[PDB]
Design a protein around this nucleic acid. Structure first.
Lengths: 264, 69, 101, 119, 88
RNA sequence: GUGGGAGAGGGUGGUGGAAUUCCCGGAGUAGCGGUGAAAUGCGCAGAUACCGGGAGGAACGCCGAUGGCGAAGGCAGCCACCUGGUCCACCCGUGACGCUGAGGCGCGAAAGCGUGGGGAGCAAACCGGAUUACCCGGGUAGUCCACGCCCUAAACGAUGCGCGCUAGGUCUCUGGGUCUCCUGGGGGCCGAAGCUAACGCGUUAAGCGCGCCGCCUGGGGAGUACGGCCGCAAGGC
């Protein structure tokens, strides 16, 4: 058992932040002990629970007698397809939400891959660390800025809904927990030639952050390893980008840079 | 019994007095500490310098192998 | 014009001819670099605790010289060019500091 | 096969494992033995008993080549050096000398994370 | 190094009277010689930071001695500075 | 000034061996490696043990010290050159030429950075594995060099510098003398008087005095905001 939140107050506040109403639908990831599930199911039209824990599921399953919307599906969210779930279990409520209070070493890759899964859902609200929360919801020219902020910029505009004290968690974490909201955008924030190529670019830029954009792109890029001799024209193709870094630049800057990269 | 005890009269800056120099090295080609040699630090320091110099000349072993289990 | 000692260790696997020519050439270099030898000690063959240049044996030669200080490096680099010599170590002449007098 | 009649037995006594190799004076390795070839896996590979068995196995499989006398040098600081040497000498080959030649760096390369913090 | 020969020669040259080894002029001359040698050394050896501190202290000492000399007697000061070509 | 002494103080060239990793061979059979226990991983394209030859980079095992040097940061193979600081002795020269120091100038561990080299080993990030539901296998920048930036620390003795006076005992490093001992300088441990809220300090004062400098005025807000200065930037004052 990980650090489990025991406060009804902050749980009520978070489930309010989730806007769990009659129309609103809920996806449960790692139902666990079943406090979040308790506060969600009563106000949700249909709750679908995904978990791979052996015994953390069927014990909770006993308590799910008063709830009629608890369609618990025993599987790993990463391994198992979720596309079918939209058709099968959201016939009751087309609106989609994902809520999680899990440990973060499992939570963050789950969120990343879910966004990679390309399932069109309205939004997601998850529980994460303060540092990673800053990392996701970041502005240009910040120490808390990086590739993760760039990645989440395509999908959503984020803000920590309500900072959480460490006390509420049973064992106490040393670092403060901060719950963020991720509400999916209409589409891509800024257009690009290739999505994968864009991601490769952003990885290359922020690989050795401290170095200049030029020094990053010289050594980081694999195709850059190919065209090391050719990086002259790469310098040429730069527009209004002088002696610069990654963190300095913004989403539109990197998008234009990628669009230029395809033309090289 | 200190190594100094089982010796007579000699010079330390003489980096060619090889026969006396083998005495100050252990069963392994290591320089014995002051506890075993029985010299003052100044003497120990100058002797270590001379020993290293002779090692460079190849008159003395940098390391050896010990006949024991 | 300080007093230095010069050490040359060279190939033992040489007869009188190569030995003599090496001696004369190194003496030529010595007198070339503004040096002035006083005394020469010849040590012949000595066993080495470790093999140098794939050879467990070595031939030894000893000089003490008073010569210009600025040119000792030049002499050391000169004597080391030949493949017949293994180690050349020039050290300053040190006073016999005795023990337990 | 060779019948050198006089070789040398190398004992590589690491922490995790002990290796025994018998070879001619020319360094040509005739054969070898370890804790692994006996069948021991994992932790018990470097146990003193494994060292004993490895020494005996190497000696036995070396007797086929007609080896009678060896001159042993031991390498590594593993737990089963003494056990290996005693087993080898009590196997049937008259050891001339017993020596260590454990390789020690002269403050060379930077070691692993765990092996650091040297006094 | 500054051998005995040239050191003694400078001492003899700048001595006020025979048997003077410690007067202001002699001190200034010796400091100037040391300063010159160290200056050329640091010119050749740019990244020898430890010696530069010594150079600074020597320059300071010479400056203080010259200040005292000028205070007590300006004519000797002018004569010494023209003899040694200090401050230009 | 003269006559000596010790020292990983600094800069520049040269080269000594032991490892580690690769390459080229000879022999070698089924594992090697790893852990609390394991897995990943390598190995039948013959691994690991081992013998020989070669390449390359980095760091100097015993000596080694509770040691030494430096104004700090720091400085360990060896050889040579160019240099900085310092101690003792002779009392030989000068006649107060001294102390401190707002700004200025310079130095400044480690980590960063620009422009070029180098890359053995270790190793941020990262790719893997696994269990206690940190640890092992790989690996990038970086750690290495030249030039130019950055100017930060538990940059600590948490103790600014200089000088004088105030019991001693003991262990060390380095000198001098007439050498069981006297006399200087440096580094530790007990402890008179004294001081301190106490812990403790105590001839290397946190004692008794003098001179100069730098800072403090309840805790947060906050080393934050604004403004200014310095940097390519991160950032610094």
């Amino acid at each position: 058992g990980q650090n489990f939140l025991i406060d009804t107050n902050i749980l009520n506040r978070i489930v309010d932040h989730a806007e769990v109403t009659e129309k609103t639908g809920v996806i449960e990831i790692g139902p666990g002990i079943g406090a979040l599930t308790e506060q969600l199911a009563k106000r949700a039209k249909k709750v679908v629970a995904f978990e791979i824990d052996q015994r953390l599921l069927p014990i909770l399953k006993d308590t799910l007698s008063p709830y009629e919307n608890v369609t618990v599906i025993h599987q790993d969210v990463l391994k198992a397809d979720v596309k079918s779930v939209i058709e099968e279990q959201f016939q009751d409520c087309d609106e989609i939400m994902v809520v999680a209070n899990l440990p973060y070493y499992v939570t963050t890759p789950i969120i990343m891959k879910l966004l990679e899964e390309h399932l069109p859902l309205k939004g997601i609200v998850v529980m994460l660390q303060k540092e990673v929360a800053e990392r996701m919801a970041a502005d240009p020219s910040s120490k808390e800025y990086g590739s993760l902020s760039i990645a989440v910029q395509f999908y959503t505009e984020a803000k920590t809904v309500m900072i959480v004290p460490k006390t509420v968690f049973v064992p106490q974490p040393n670092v403060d927990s901060a719950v963020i909201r991720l509400i999916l955008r209409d589409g891509p924030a800024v257009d690009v030639e290739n999505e994968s190529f864009f991601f490769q670019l952003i990885k290359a830029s922020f690989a050795q952050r401290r170095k200049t954009l030029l020094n990053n792109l010289v050594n980081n890029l694999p195709e850059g390893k190919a065209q090391k001799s050719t990086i002259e024209q790469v310098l040429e193709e730069t527009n209004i980008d002088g002696k610069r870094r990654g963190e300095s630049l913004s989403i539109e800057e990197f998008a234009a840079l990628s669009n230029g990269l395809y033309k090289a | 019994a200190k190594v100094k005890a089982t010796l007579g009269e000699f010079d330390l800056r003489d980096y060619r007095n090889v026969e006396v120099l083998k005495r100050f090295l252990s069963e392994t080609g290591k320089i014995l500490p002051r506890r075993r040699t029985g010299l003052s630090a100044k003497e120990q320091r100058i002797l270590a310098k001379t020993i290293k110099r002779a090692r460079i000349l190849g008159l003395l072993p940098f390391t050896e192998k010990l006949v024991r289990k | 014009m300080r007093r230095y000692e010069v050490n040359i260790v060279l190939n033992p696997n040489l007869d009188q001819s190569q030995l003599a020519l090496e001696k004369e050439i190194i003496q030529r270099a010595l007198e070339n670099y503004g040096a002035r030898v006083e005394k020469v000690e010849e040590l012949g063959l000595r066993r080495l605790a470790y093999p140098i240049a794939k050879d467990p044996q070595g031939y030894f030669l000893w000089y003490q010289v008073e010569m210009p200080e600025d040119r000792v490096n030049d002499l050391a680099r000169e004597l080391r060019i030949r493949d017949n010599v293994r180690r050349v170590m020039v050290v300053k002449s040190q006073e016999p500091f005795l023990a337990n007098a | 096969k060779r019948q050198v009649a006089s070789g040398r037995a190398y004992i590589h006594a690491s922490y995790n494992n002990t290796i025994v190799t018998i070879t001619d004076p020319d360094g040509n390795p005739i054969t070898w033995s370890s804790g692994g070839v006996i069948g021991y896996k994992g932790s018990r590979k470097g146990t003193p008993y494994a060292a004993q068995l490895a020494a005996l196995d190497a000696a036995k499989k070396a007797m086929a080549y007609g080896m009678q006398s060896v001159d042993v040098i031991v390498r590594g600081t593993g737990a089963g050096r003494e056990q290996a040497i005693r087993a080898l000498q009590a196997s049937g080959l008259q050891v001339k000398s017993i020596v260590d030649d454990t390789p020690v760096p002269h403050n060379g390369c930077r070691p692993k994370k765990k092996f650091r913090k040297a006094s | 190094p500054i051998t005995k020969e040239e050191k003694q020669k400078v001492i003899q040259e700048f001595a006020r009277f025979p048997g003077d080894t410690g007067s202001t002029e002699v001190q200034v001359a010796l400091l100037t010689l040391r300063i010159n040698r160290l200056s050329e050394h640091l010119k050749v050896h740019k990244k020898d930071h430890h010696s530069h501190r010594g150079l600074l202290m020597m320059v300071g000492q010479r400056r203080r001695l010259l200040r005292y000399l000028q205070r007590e007697d300006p004519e000797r000061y002018r004569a010494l500075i023209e003899k040694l070509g200090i401050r230009g």
